[PDB]
Coordinates of C-alpha atoms in Angstrom, one line a residue:
Chain J
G21 CA 79.3 173.3 123.4
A22 CA 82.6 171.8 124.3
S23 CA 83.5 174.4 126.5
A24 CA 81.2 173.0 129.1
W25 CA 82.7 169.6 128.8
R26 CA 86.3 170.9 128.8
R27 CA 85.9 172.7 132.2
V28 CA 84.0 169.8 134.1
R29 CA 87.2 167.5 134.2
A30 CA 89.8 170.0 135.1
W31 CA 89.0 169.2 138.8
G32 CA 88.3 165.5 138.6
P33 CA 90.2 164.4 141.8
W34 CA 88.3 166.4 144.3
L35 CA 84.7 165.3 143.1
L36 CA 86.1 161.7 143.1
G37 CA 87.5 162.7 146.6
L38 CA 84.0 164.1 147.6
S39 CA 81.8 161.1 146.7
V40 CA 84.2 158.6 148.5
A41 CA 83.5 160.6 151.8
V42 CA 80.0 160.3 151.4
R43 CA 80.4 156.4 150.5
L44 CA 82.5 155.8 153.8
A45 CA 79.9 157.7 156.0
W46 CA 76.9 155.8 154.6
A47 CA 78.2 152.4 155.6
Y48 CA 79.7 153.6 158.9
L49 CA 76.7 156.0 159.9
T50 CA 73.5 154.1 159.2
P51 CA 71.6 151.3 160.5
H52 CA 72.6 148.1 158.8
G53 CA 75.0 150.1 156.8
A54 CA 78.2 148.0 157.2
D55 CA 77.1 144.4 157.8
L56 CA 79.1 142.7 154.9
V57 CA 77.6 139.5 155.1
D58 CA 79.4 138.3 152.2
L59 CA 82.8 139.2 153.5
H60 CA 81.7 137.6 156.7
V61 CA 81.0 134.2 154.7
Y62 CA 84.4 134.6 153.1
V63 CA 86.4 135.1 156.1
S64 CA 84.4 132.8 158.8
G65 CA 84.5 130.0 156.2
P66 CA 88.1 129.0 156.1
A67 CA 88.2 129.0 160.1
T68 CA 86.7 125.6 160.2
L69 CA 89.8 124.0 158.8
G70 CA 91.5 121.0 160.8
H71 CA 88.1 120.5 162.6
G72 CA 84.7 120.0 161.3
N73 CA 83.8 120.6 157.6
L74 CA 83.8 123.9 155.8
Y75 CA 80.6 123.0 154.0
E76 CA 78.6 122.0 157.2
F77 CA 78.6 125.8 157.7
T78 CA 76.1 128.5 158.5
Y79 CA 76.1 132.1 159.1
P80 CA 72.9 133.9 160.3
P89 CA 76.0 128.7 153.5
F90 CA 79.4 128.5 151.9
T91 CA 79.3 127.1 148.3
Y92 CA 82.4 128.1 146.7
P93 CA 85.5 126.0 145.6
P94 CA 88.0 124.8 148.0
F95 CA 90.6 127.1 146.1
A96 CA 88.9 130.2 147.4
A97 CA 88.9 128.6 151.2
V98 CA 92.7 128.3 150.5
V99 CA 93.1 131.8 149.3
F100 CA 91.0 133.3 152.1
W101 CA 92.7 131.1 154.9
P102 CA 95.2 134.0 155.5
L103 CA 92.4 136.7 156.3
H104 CA 90.9 135.4 159.7
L105 CA 94.1 136.6 161.6
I106 CA 93.7 140.3 160.8
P107 CA 90.7 141.9 162.8
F108 CA 87.4 142.1 161.0
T109 CA 87.3 146.0 161.1
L110 CA 90.6 146.5 159.3
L111 CA 89.7 144.4 156.5
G112 CA 86.5 145.8 156.1
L113 CA 88.1 149.0 156.1
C114 CA 90.5 148.0 153.4
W115 CA 87.9 146.1 151.2
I116 CA 86.1 149.3 150.2
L117 CA 89.2 151.2 149.3
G118 CA 90.6 148.3 147.2
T119 CA 87.3 148.4 145.4
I120 CA 87.3 151.8 144.3
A121 CA 91.0 151.6 143.5
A122 CA 89.9 148.6 141.2
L123 CA 87.3 150.6 139.4
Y124 CA 89.6 153.5 138.7
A125 CA 92.0 151.0 137.4
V126 CA 89.4 149.5 135.1
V127 CA 88.5 152.9 133.8
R128 CA 92.2 153.7 133.3
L129 CA 92.6 150.2 131.3
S130 CA 89.6 151.1 129.3
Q131 CA 91.1 154.6 128.4
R132 CA 94.3 152.9 127.4
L133 CA 92.6 150.4 125.4
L134 CA 90.8 152.8 123.4
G135 CA 94.4 154.4 122.5
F136 CA 94.7 157.6 124.9
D137 CA 95.0 158.5 128.5
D138 CA 93.5 161.1 130.9
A139 CA 93.7 161.0 134.8
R140 CA 91.1 163.7 135.3
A141 CA 88.5 162.1 132.8
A142 CA 89.0 158.7 134.4
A143 CA 88.5 160.3 137.9
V144 CA 85.2 162.0 136.7
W145 CA 84.0 158.7 135.0
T146 CA 84.6 156.9 138.2
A147 CA 82.7 159.5 140.3
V148 CA 79.8 159.5 138.1
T149 CA 79.6 155.7 137.6
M150 CA 80.2 154.8 141.2
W151 CA 76.6 155.1 142.1
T152 CA 74.9 153.0 139.2
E153 CA 72.7 150.2 140.3
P154 CA 75.3 147.2 139.9
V155 CA 78.1 148.9 141.1
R156 CA 76.0 150.3 144.0
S157 CA 74.8 146.9 145.1
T158 CA 78.0 145.4 144.6
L159 CA 79.9 146.9 147.6
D160 CA 77.1 146.7 149.9
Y161 CA 77.5 143.1 150.3
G162 CA 81.1 142.9 149.9
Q163 CA 81.6 140.9 146.7
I164 CA 84.6 140.7 144.6
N165 CA 83.2 141.1 141.0
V166 CA 85.5 144.4 140.3
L167 CA 88.7 142.5 141.2
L168 CA 87.7 139.9 138.9
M169 CA 86.9 142.4 135.9
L170 CA 90.2 144.2 136.7
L171 CA 92.0 140.6 136.4
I172 CA 90.3 140.0 133.1
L173 CA 91.0 143.3 131.7
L174 CA 94.7 143.1 132.5
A175 CA 94.9 139.8 131.0
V176 CA 93.3 141.1 127.9
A177 CA 95.7 144.1 127.7
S178 CA 98.9 142.0 128.1
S179 CA 100.9 140.6 125.3
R180 CA 102.5 137.6 126.9
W181 CA 101.0 134.3 127.0
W182 CA 102.2 133.2 130.6
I183 CA 100.8 136.2 132.1
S184 CA 97.5 136.4 130.8
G185 CA 97.1 132.5 131.1
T186 CA 97.9 132.6 134.8
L187 CA 95.7 135.6 135.3
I188 CA 92.7 133.7 133.7
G189 CA 93.3 130.6 135.4
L190 CA 93.6 132.5 139.0
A191 CA 90.5 134.5 138.2
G192 CA 88.6 131.2 137.2
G193 CA 89.8 129.3 140.0
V194 CA 87.9 131.2 142.7
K195 CA 84.7 131.7 140.7
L196 CA 83.5 129.6 137.8
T197 CA 81.7 132.2 135.9
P198 CA 84.6 134.3 134.6
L199 CA 85.5 131.5 132.2
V200 CA 83.6 132.7 129.4
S201 CA 86.6 135.2 128.3
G202 CA 88.0 131.9 126.9
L203 CA 85.4 132.6 124.0
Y204 CA 86.8 136.0 123.0
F205 CA 90.4 134.6 123.5
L206 CA 89.7 132.1 120.7
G207 CA 87.9 134.5 118.8
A208 CA 90.9 136.8 118.7
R209 CA 93.1 133.9 117.5
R210 CA 95.3 133.9 120.6
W211 CA 95.9 130.3 121.0
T212 CA 98.0 128.4 123.6
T213 CA 96.4 131.1 126.0
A214 CA 93.5 128.7 126.6
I215 CA 95.9 125.9 127.1
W216 CA 98.0 127.6 129.7
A217 CA 94.7 128.8 131.4
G218 CA 93.4 125.2 131.5
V219 CA 96.7 124.0 132.9
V220 CA 96.4 126.9 135.6
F221 CA 92.8 125.9 136.5
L222 CA 93.8 122.1 136.7
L223 CA 96.5 123.1 139.2
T224 CA 94.0 125.3 141.3
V225 CA 91.6 122.3 141.4
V226 CA 94.5 120.0 142.5
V227 CA 95.7 122.1 145.2
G228 CA 92.2 122.6 146.3
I229 CA 91.7 118.8 146.6
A230 CA 95.0 118.5 148.6
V231 CA 94.7 121.0 151.1
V232 CA 91.2 120.2 152.2
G233 CA 89.8 116.7 152.9
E234 CA 89.1 115.6 149.5
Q235 CA 85.9 117.9 149.3
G236 CA 86.5 119.3 146.0
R237 CA 85.1 116.1 144.2
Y238 CA 82.1 116.2 146.4
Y239 CA 81.6 119.8 145.6
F240 CA 81.6 119.3 141.9
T241 CA 79.4 116.4 142.2
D242 CA 76.8 118.6 144.3
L243 CA 77.2 121.4 141.9
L244 CA 75.8 119.3 139.1
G245 CA 73.2 117.9 141.4
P252 CA 65.1 131.8 144.3
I253 CA 64.9 131.9 140.6
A254 CA 61.6 133.6 140.2
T255 CA 62.7 136.8 142.0
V256 CA 62.9 140.3 140.4
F257 CA 66.7 140.6 141.2
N258 CA 67.3 137.8 138.7
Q259 CA 67.7 139.4 135.3
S260 CA 68.4 136.4 133.2
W261 CA 66.1 134.6 130.5
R262 CA 65.1 131.7 132.8
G263 CA 63.9 134.5 135.8
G264 CA 62.1 136.3 133.3
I265 CA 60.3 133.4 131.7
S266 CA 59.5 131.6 135.1
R267 CA 58.1 135.3 136.2
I268 CA 55.7 135.4 133.1
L269 CA 54.9 131.7 133.4
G270 CA 54.4 131.3 137.1
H271 CA 56.4 128.3 137.4
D272 CA 59.8 127.1 136.7
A273 CA 61.0 127.1 133.1
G274 CA 64.3 125.3 133.0
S275 CA 64.5 123.4 129.7
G276 CA 61.2 124.2 128.2
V277 CA 60.0 124.6 124.8
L278 CA 60.5 128.3 124.4
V279 CA 63.7 128.9 126.6
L280 CA 65.6 126.7 123.8
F281 CA 64.3 129.3 121.4
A282 CA 64.8 132.5 123.7
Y283 CA 68.5 131.5 124.2
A284 CA 68.6 130.5 120.6
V285 CA 68.0 133.9 119.1
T286 CA 70.0 135.4 121.6
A287 CA 73.1 133.4 120.7
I288 CA 72.5 134.3 116.7
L289 CA 72.3 138.0 117.8
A290 CA 75.1 138.1 119.7
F291 CA 77.2 136.3 116.9
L292 CA 76.1 139.0 114.4
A293 CA 76.8 141.9 117.0
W294 CA 80.4 140.6 117.5
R295 CA 81.1 140.3 113.7
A296 CA 80.0 143.7 113.5
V297 CA 82.9 145.3 115.8
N298 CA 86.6 144.7 115.0
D299 CA 88.4 145.9 118.2
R300 CA 89.3 144.5 121.5
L301 CA 87.1 146.3 123.8
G302 CA 84.0 146.0 121.7
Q303 CA 84.6 142.2 121.1
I304 CA 84.8 141.6 124.9
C305 CA 82.1 143.7 125.8
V306 CA 80.0 141.7 123.4
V307 CA 81.3 138.3 124.9
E308 CA 80.7 139.6 128.4
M309 CA 77.2 140.8 127.6
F310 CA 76.3 137.2 126.0
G311 CA 77.6 135.4 129.1
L312 CA 75.5 137.6 131.4
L313 CA 72.4 136.9 129.5
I314 CA 73.2 133.1 129.2
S315 CA 73.8 132.5 132.9
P316 CA 70.8 130.8 134.6
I317 CA 71.4 132.9 137.7
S318 CA 72.5 136.5 137.3
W319 CA 71.8 138.9 140.0
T320 CA 71.8 142.7 139.2
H321 CA 75.3 143.0 141.0
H322 CA 76.7 140.9 138.0
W323 CA 76.0 143.7 135.6
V324 CA 79.3 145.7 136.4
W325 CA 80.6 145.4 132.7
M326 CA 78.2 147.8 131.3
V327 CA 80.9 150.6 132.4
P328 CA 83.4 149.5 129.5
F329 CA 80.6 149.0 127.3
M330 CA 79.4 152.8 127.9
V331 CA 82.9 154.2 127.8
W332 CA 83.3 152.2 124.4
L333 CA 79.9 153.7 123.1
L334 CA 81.1 157.2 124.0
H335 CA 84.5 157.3 123.0
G336 CA 84.7 154.4 120.5
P337 CA 85.1 154.4 116.7
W338 CA 81.2 154.8 116.4
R339 CA 81.2 157.9 118.1
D340 CA 80.2 160.0 115.2
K341 CA 76.7 158.5 114.9
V342 CA 73.7 159.8 116.3
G343 CA 72.5 156.2 117.2
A344 CA 75.3 155.4 119.6
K345 CA 74.6 158.8 121.3
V346 CA 70.9 157.8 122.1
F347 CA 71.8 154.4 123.0
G348 CA 74.6 155.6 125.6
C349 CA 72.3 158.2 127.4
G350 CA 69.3 155.6 127.5
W351 CA 71.6 153.0 129.1
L352 CA 73.1 155.5 131.4
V353 CA 69.7 156.8 132.6
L354 CA 68.2 153.3 132.8
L355 CA 71.0 152.1 135.0
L356 CA 70.9 155.1 137.2
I357 CA 67.2 154.9 137.8
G358 CA 67.2 151.2 138.8
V359 CA 64.0 149.7 137.4
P360 CA 64.3 146.2 138.9
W361 CA 65.1 147.6 142.2
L362 CA 61.9 149.8 142.2
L363 CA 59.8 147.1 141.1
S364 CA 61.2 145.0 143.9
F365 CA 58.8 146.8 146.3
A366 CA 55.7 145.0 144.5
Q367 CA 57.2 141.6 144.0
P368 CA 55.0 139.1 145.9
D369 CA 56.5 136.5 148.3
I370 CA 56.1 133.6 145.6
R375 CA 51.0 138.1 139.5
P376 CA 49.5 141.0 138.1
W377 CA 50.6 141.4 134.6
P378 CA 51.0 145.2 134.8
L379 CA 53.8 144.5 137.5
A380 CA 55.0 141.1 135.9
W381 CA 55.5 142.1 132.4
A382 CA 58.2 144.9 134.0
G383 CA 60.6 142.6 135.0
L384 CA 62.2 142.2 131.3
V385 CA 63.3 145.9 130.7
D386 CA 67.1 145.0 130.9
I387 CA 66.4 141.8 128.8
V388 CA 64.8 143.9 126.2
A389 CA 67.3 146.7 126.3
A390 CA 70.1 144.3 125.7
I391 CA 68.1 142.6 122.8
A392 CA 67.4 146.0 121.0
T393 CA 71.4 147.1 121.5
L394 CA 72.4 143.8 120.2
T395 CA 69.8 143.9 117.2
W396 CA 70.9 147.6 116.5
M397 CA 74.4 146.8 116.3
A398 CA 73.7 143.6 114.2
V399 CA 71.7 145.8 111.7
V400 CA 74.3 148.5 111.5
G401 CA 77.1 146.1 110.8
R402 CA 75.1 144.5 108.2
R403 CA 74.4 147.5 106.2
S404 CA 78.0 148.7 106.3
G405 CA 79.2 145.4 104.7
Chain X
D1 CA 119.4 155.2 119.9
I2 CA 118.6 152.5 117.4
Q3 CA 120.3 153.0 114.2
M4 CA 119.1 152.1 110.4
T5 CA 121.0 151.0 107.6
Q6 CA 119.5 150.3 104.1
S7 CA 121.2 149.5 100.5
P8 CA 120.5 152.3 98.2
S9 CA 121.7 150.5 95.0
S10 CA 118.0 150.1 93.2
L11 CA 118.2 151.0 89.6
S12 CA 117.3 150.4 85.9
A13 CA 113.4 150.9 87.1
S14 CA 112.4 148.2 84.5
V15 CA 108.8 148.1 84.0
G16 CA 107.4 144.7 85.9
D17 CA 110.5 144.1 87.7
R18 CA 110.6 143.0 91.1
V19 CA 111.9 145.2 94.1
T20 CA 113.7 144.5 97.4
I21 CA 114.9 147.1 99.9
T22 CA 116.3 145.9 103.3
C23 CA 116.5 148.1 106.6
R24 CA 118.7 146.4 108.7
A25 CA 118.1 147.7 112.4
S26 CA 119.9 147.1 115.7
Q27 CA 118.5 146.5 119.4
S28 CA 114.9 145.2 119.1
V29 CA 112.2 147.6 117.6
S30 CA 109.7 144.7 118.1
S31 CA 107.3 145.1 115.1
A32 CA 107.0 149.0 115.3
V33 CA 108.2 149.8 111.9
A34 CA 106.8 151.6 108.8
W35 CA 107.4 152.5 105.3
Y36 CA 107.0 155.9 103.2
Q37 CA 107.1 156.9 99.8
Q38 CA 108.0 160.5 98.8
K39 CA 108.1 162.2 95.2
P40 CA 110.2 165.3 94.6
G41 CA 108.6 168.6 95.6
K42 CA 105.9 166.8 97.3
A43 CA 105.2 165.6 101.0
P44 CA 105.5 161.6 101.7
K45 CA 102.7 159.3 102.1
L46 CA 102.2 156.1 104.4
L47 CA 102.7 152.8 102.4
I48 CA 103.0 149.9 105.0
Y49 CA 102.6 150.2 108.9
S50 CA 102.8 148.0 111.9
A51 CA 105.8 146.3 110.0
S52 CA 103.2 143.8 108.6
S53 CA 99.9 145.7 107.6
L54 CA 99.5 147.2 104.4
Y55 CA 97.7 150.5 104.2
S56 CA 94.0 151.0 102.5
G57 CA 94.5 152.6 99.2
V58 CA 97.9 151.5 97.7
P59 CA 97.5 149.4 94.5
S60 CA 100.9 149.7 93.1
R61 CA 102.9 148.6 96.2
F62 CA 101.1 145.6 97.4
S63 CA 103.5 143.8 99.7
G64 CA 104.5 143.0 103.1
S65 CA 107.7 142.4 105.3
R66 CA 109.4 139.6 107.6
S67 CA 109.5 141.3 111.0
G68 CA 112.4 139.3 112.0
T69 CA 114.7 142.3 112.7
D70 CA 115.1 142.6 108.9
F71 CA 112.3 143.9 106.6
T72 CA 111.8 143.7 103.1
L73 CA 109.1 145.3 100.4
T74 CA 108.0 143.1 97.5
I75 CA 106.9 145.7 94.9
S76 CA 105.9 143.1 92.2
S77 CA 105.4 145.3 89.6
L78 CA 106.6 148.8 88.4
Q79 CA 104.0 149.9 86.0
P80 CA 103.5 153.6 87.0
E81 CA 107.6 153.8 87.0
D82 CA 107.1 154.3 90.9
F83 CA 110.0 157.1 90.7
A84 CA 110.3 158.0 94.5
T85 CA 112.4 157.7 97.7
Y86 CA 111.4 155.2 100.0
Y87 CA 112.4 155.3 103.8
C88 CA 112.0 153.1 107.1
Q89 CA 111.4 154.1 110.6
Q90 CA 110.9 152.9 114.1
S91 CA 108.7 154.2 116.9
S92 CA 109.6 152.0 120.0
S93 CA 112.6 153.6 121.8
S94 CA 110.6 157.1 122.3
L95 CA 112.8 158.2 119.7
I96 CA 112.3 158.2 115.9
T97 CA 115.0 157.5 113.3
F98 CA 114.9 157.4 109.6
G99 CA 116.8 156.0 106.7
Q100 CA 117.7 156.6 103.0
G101 CA 117.1 154.8 99.7
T102 CA 116.2 155.9 96.2
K103 CA 115.4 154.4 92.7
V104 CA 116.8 155.4 89.4
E105 CA 115.7 154.4 86.0
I106 CA 117.8 152.7 83.0
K107 CA 120.2 154.9 81.1
Chain T
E1 CA 88.1 166.5 104.6
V2 CA 91.0 166.2 106.7
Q3 CA 93.4 169.2 106.1
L4 CA 96.7 170.4 107.6
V5 CA 98.0 173.9 106.8
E6 CA 101.5 175.5 107.8
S7 CA 101.9 179.3 107.8
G8 CA 105.4 180.3 110.0
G9 CA 108.3 180.2 107.3
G10 CA 110.6 183.4 107.1
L11 CA 113.9 184.4 106.7
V12 CA 115.3 184.5 110.4
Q13 CA 118.9 185.7 111.5
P14 CA 121.5 183.4 112.9
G15 CA 120.3 184.1 116.5
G16 CA 116.8 184.7 117.7
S17 CA 113.7 182.8 117.9
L18 CA 110.6 181.8 115.7
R19 CA 107.2 179.8 115.9
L20 CA 105.4 177.8 113.7
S21 CA 101.4 177.0 113.2
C22 CA 100.0 173.8 111.7
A23 CA 96.2 174.2 111.6
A24 CA 93.8 171.2 111.3
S25 CA 90.1 170.6 110.0
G26 CA 87.9 167.7 110.0
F27 CA 89.0 165.8 113.3
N28 CA 89.6 166.4 116.9
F29 CA 93.2 166.3 118.5
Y30 CA 92.0 164.4 121.5
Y31 CA 92.5 161.3 119.8
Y32 CA 95.4 161.8 117.9
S33 CA 99.1 162.8 118.1
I34 CA 101.1 165.6 116.0
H35 CA 104.7 165.2 115.0
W36 CA 107.1 167.6 113.3
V37 CA 109.6 166.2 110.7
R38 CA 112.3 168.3 108.8
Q39 CA 114.3 167.9 105.8
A40 CA 117.6 169.6 105.0
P41 CA 117.9 170.6 101.3
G42 CA 119.6 167.7 99.4
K43 CA 119.4 165.3 102.5
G44 CA 116.7 162.8 104.0
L45 CA 114.2 163.2 106.6
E46 CA 114.9 163.7 110.2
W47 CA 112.5 163.7 113.3
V48 CA 112.3 166.6 115.4
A49 CA 109.5 166.3 118.2
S50 CA 106.2 164.3 119.1
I51 CA 103.3 164.9 121.6
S52 CA 100.2 163.1 122.7
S53 CA 97.7 165.8 122.8
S54 CA 96.0 164.3 125.9
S55 CA 98.5 163.9 128.5
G56 CA 101.8 165.9 127.4
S57 CA 104.8 166.2 125.2
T58 CA 107.9 164.4 125.3
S59 CA 110.8 163.1 123.0
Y60 CA 112.7 166.4 122.2
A61 CA 115.4 164.3 120.4
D62 CA 118.9 165.9 121.4
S63 CA 118.7 169.5 120.2
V64 CA 116.4 170.5 123.0
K65 CA 115.4 174.0 122.5
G66 CA 111.6 173.8 120.9
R67 CA 108.5 174.2 123.0
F68 CA 106.0 172.4 120.6
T69 CA 102.5 173.0 122.6
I70 CA 99.0 172.6 121.2
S71 CA 96.0 174.3 121.9
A72 CA 93.2 171.9 121.8
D73 CA 89.6 172.9 121.0
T74 CA 91.0 176.4 120.4
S75 CA 91.0 176.8 116.5
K76 CA 92.6 173.5 116.5
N77 CA 96.1 174.9 116.8
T78 CA 99.3 173.1 117.0
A79 CA 102.6 175.3 117.4
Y80 CA 106.3 174.8 117.7
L81 CA 108.7 177.5 119.2
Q82 CA 112.3 177.3 118.4
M83 CA 115.0 179.3 120.3
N84 CA 117.6 179.3 117.5
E87 CA 119.1 174.6 114.0
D88 CA 119.7 175.0 110.2
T89 CA 117.8 175.6 107.0
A90 CA 115.5 172.8 106.2
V91 CA 111.6 172.3 105.4
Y92 CA 109.2 171.3 108.1
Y93 CA 106.0 169.0 107.9
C94 CA 103.4 168.2 110.5
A95 CA 101.6 164.9 110.5
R96 CA 99.1 162.7 112.5
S97 CA 99.4 159.4 114.0
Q98 CA 97.8 157.1 116.6
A99 CA 99.2 155.3 119.6
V100 CA 99.0 151.5 120.7
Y101 CA 99.5 150.5 124.4
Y102 CA 100.6 147.2 125.8
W103 CA 101.2 146.0 129.4
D104 CA 104.0 143.4 130.1
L105 CA 104.8 144.0 134.0
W106 CA 104.9 147.7 132.7
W107 CA 103.3 149.9 130.4
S108 CA 105.1 150.4 127.1
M109 CA 103.6 152.0 123.9
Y110 CA 104.8 152.7 120.2
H111 CA 103.2 154.6 117.3
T112 CA 101.0 153.0 114.5
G113 CA 102.7 155.3 111.7
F114 CA 102.1 158.5 110.2
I115 CA 98.6 158.6 108.4
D116 CA 98.8 159.7 104.6
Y117 CA 97.3 163.2 106.1
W118 CA 100.5 164.9 105.7
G119 CA 101.0 168.7 105.1
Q120 CA 103.0 170.9 102.8
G121 CA 106.2 172.1 104.0
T122 CA 107.8 175.8 104.9
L123 CA 111.1 177.5 103.8
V124 CA 112.5 178.7 106.8
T125 CA 116.2 179.7 106.5
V126 CA 118.7 180.8 109.1

């Protein structure tokens, strides 16, 4: 029984050190293995400063706030190969730090167990596809977790503001921070965000206002795993603000609220908040689902570890994420729908809905 | 090391009387303070933890504290005669220190 | 449910060594911490040592002569090993840790849960 689990993590560092060698070989020994198109867009964007426009840019477009351009400006000096070498190492280092933060938030620590966890979960579909393009999701997750784990107002506020300046999606953590009654954190984060907007306006040729105006002014693919994507896939035409999308998001709001009320610890609350944010977002690719690792760790090591439901859900989530159902379906997706194939693009949505319902019911029956 | 000081002067154990005990600390223990109750010949038992969080299952010692570098317990009633010895500690400096403080009944 | 039992009490001589044992039932050591507290006869409580049961043992106060190891998942054993102080009564208790990060990692303890154990009668 427990004898098998004990001896596996006694040699955590070399299984982490074994998968990294395979990961750094796949990129540098396969055709189209180390293109890093997103890192290319990140770097070759701020190069057009002092001449031309950063938004009249194409790469065989840059649609990030000017604060990101200011941040990435001191990156075109370094040769691209060295930066590409360092980026992946930073990514796995951030993942290891995230697992360590989750362990400490539970109430214990173990370096070997964290190494084994990172080695096992490095190849999950969201994490697997995250570092294929060169995205920055893991760093933002690490920043949010560091802000959550801290106890000082200024540290957390500055971390949240800086994380939300570069990308506009990780501003949903304010919902959790208001839920935990940690006031003045939202105020300091808002001040930091406004200073980031001001400096972005000042550094570039007043392009931030135009960027925000254009922001207000494909989604039918199978990679998009949000409500809008699934409704559009089933219907065949764009859903938008339809007569069922309001009910579809409506009932997910109430399920998320009930599930949040069920749990009464930091990691569970932040996991439910991030799941709600993932489900509500209009465009949420599969690489945005890197938040299922802390949720899995909470399922396996949290207070509810004594139930035989939590175990079933954890194992099912692990196998489902490892298999990668939408990636498999992507080979059948038409260019622009047979219903046995169109009805399978909602597996992650139904899994999340079932998890929310189960947590809500077990929270209700416990009073 | 962070020392502790109390005022072992509680007496007369009159039924329904209020109780106040002070644990005067040094340095900064932050909010990592707990209190215990022990009867003669028996092991102690936790009463209040986190310096402001009451436990689950203590009906006769419903109180709190201040957390402003000085800690008090408001034992509103003394119905079961609550004859025991109470202690305060800290668990912040990687070392744990205790105190004193008993209660006696009327003559 | 949760139980803690001690057995290593005796009448050791002024010089030598002895060991203690505090077993458990109904929970797992991987999520909690174990401490030992002693009390001289006619005096107050005094803390001796602390452990994490997941990473390692520290906090040996100033009379540093004990060992205080744990054999996790092997009969749920907690054992102390003294190389000599004075007559007292020793207890074993359980607690939980809380972590915080302010430019560096600091931690404290929640407080020993009501799951205490009865004492021993060691005597030099």
